[PDB]
Design a protein around this motif. Structure first.
Motif, PDB file in Angstrom:
ATOM      1  N   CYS A  21       0.785  -1.134  -0.124  1.00 47.39           N
ATOM      2  CA  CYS A  21      -0.042  -0.134  -0.076  1.00 47.39           C
ATOM      3  C   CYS A  21       0.992   1.276   0.118  1.00 47.39           C
ATOM      4  O   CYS A  21       1.893   1.330   0.485  1.00 47.39           O
ATOM      5  N   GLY A  22       0.237   2.360  -0.644  1.00 45.31           N
ATOM      6  CA  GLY A  22       0.710   3.740  -0.799  1.00 45.31           C
ATOM      7  C   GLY A  22      -0.030   4.558  -1.483  1.00 45.31           C
ATOM      8  O   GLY A  22      -0.942   3.822  -2.455  1.00 45.31           O
ATOM      9  N   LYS A  23      -0.329   5.619  -1.406  1.00 44.90           N
ATOM     10  CA  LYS A  23      -1.274   6.518  -1.874  1.00 44.90           C
ATOM     11  C   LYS A  23      -1.043   7.122  -3.191  1.00 44.90           C
ATOM     12  O   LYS A  23      -0.547   8.208  -3.419  1.00 44.90           O
ATOM     13  N   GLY A  24      -0.820   6.053  -3.967  1.00 47.64           N
ATOM     14  CA  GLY A  24      -0.389   6.594  -5.621  1.00 47.64           C
ATOM     15  C   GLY A  24      -0.503   5.245  -6.540  1.00 47.64           C
ATOM     16  O   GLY A  24      -0.325   4.186  -6.181  1.00 47.64           O
ATOM     17  N   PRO A  25      -0.423   5.640  -7.696  1.00 47.60           N
ATOM     18  CA  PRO A  25      -0.467   4.751  -9.004  1.00 47.60           C
ATOM     19  C   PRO A  25       0.696   3.581  -8.777  1.00 47.60           C
ATOM     20  O   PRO A  25       0.230   2.633  -9.378  1.00 47.60           O
ATOM     21  N   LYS A  26       1.535   3.879  -8.284  1.00 47.47           N
ATOM     22  CA  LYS A  26       2.850   2.932  -8.128  1.00 47.47           C
ATOM     23  C   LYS A  26       1.930   1.615  -7.732  1.00 47.47           C
ATOM     24  O   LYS A  26       2.030   0.506  -7.912  1.00 47.47           O
TER      25      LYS A  26
END
Length: 30
Positions: A21-26
């Protein structure tokens, strides 16, 4: 991050297709 809270993260960070998880398109992409 290491891995989501069984497909939930805080502060609306996206659980990747990979269950990390992480807040971006990656993560959030696909």
């Amino acid at each position: 991050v290491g891995e989501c809270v069984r497909g939930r993260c805080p502060s609306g960070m996206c659980c990747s297709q990979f269950g990390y998880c992480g807040k971006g398109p990656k993560y959030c992409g696909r």
